[PDB]
Design a binder for this molecule. Structure first.
Ligand SMILES: Nc1nc2c(ncn2[C@@H]2O[C@H](COP(=O)(O)OP(=O)(O)OP(=O)(O)O)[C@@H](O)[C@H]2O)c(=O)[nH]1
Ligand SMILES: [Mg+2]
Length: 179
């Protein structure tokens, strides 16, 4: 019936677009750095009505001081990274895991790779090669999920696949109700 899900990850990794496509099927036209947002409503998940409380947060270190205020009583935490920026994956390991482990010790964390569509975007690929990098590979992400002890690994593209975004929240809900 009710599940609280909080989304965290580095700035610009895709959190807000992920949440807006799910909650309104509306991809955000312009980018605005997030501080906090909450959207609480009844969603039809397959059949069953489930009341989700969705929390958006800041990826910026400058809000580290208040970010944890959103964590109490979370049923699932979606730790997100940007598939087009491998440094955001390192953050899941060096910062996000520790922060969730410290404030939501008993919560299920899902590792969510965002912007999967950028894996085939030439501009992205050229800029990454110029720094001797490639996008995070599927296997790289999955390996990071085992590394941090995440309940699962999943990927999406809020920009190009509404279904991929639906799948994120369906699995996050599953994580919630399985307890
Ligand atoms: N190609 C692509 N770009 C995306 C996708 N999702 C988001 N973006 C873009 O990446 C930028 C950041 O997306 P947001 O969802 O606002 O980032 P955030 O993680 O919410 O950022 P903070 O609020 O600063 O933590 C925006 O310009 C988006 O339009 C995606 O699935 N594909
Ligand atoms: Mg945001």
């Amino acid at each position: 019936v009710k599940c609280k899900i909080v989304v965290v990850g580095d700035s610009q990794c895709g959190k807000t677009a992920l949440l807006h496509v799910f909650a309104k099927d509306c991809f955000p036209e312009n980018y605005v750095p997030t501080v906090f947002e909450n959207y609480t409503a009844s969603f039809e998940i397959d059949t069953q009505r489930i009341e989700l409380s969705l929390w958006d947060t800041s990826g910026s270190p400058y809000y580290d001081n208040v970010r944890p205020l959103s964590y109490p009583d979370s049923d699932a935490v979606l730790i997100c990274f940007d598939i087009s920026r491998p440094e955001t994956l390192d953050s899941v390991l060096k910062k996000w895991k520790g922060e969730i482990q410290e404030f939501c010790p008993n919560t299920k964390m899902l590792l969510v790779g965002c912007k999967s569509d950028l894996r085939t975007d030439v501009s992205t690929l050229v800029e990454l090669s110029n720094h001797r990098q490639t996008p995070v590979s599927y296997d790289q992400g999955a390996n990071m999920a085992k590394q941090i002890g995440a309940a699962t690994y999943i990927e999406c593209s809020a920009l190009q696949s509404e279904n991929s975004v639906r799948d994120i929240f369906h699995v996050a809900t599953l994580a919630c109700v399985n307890k």
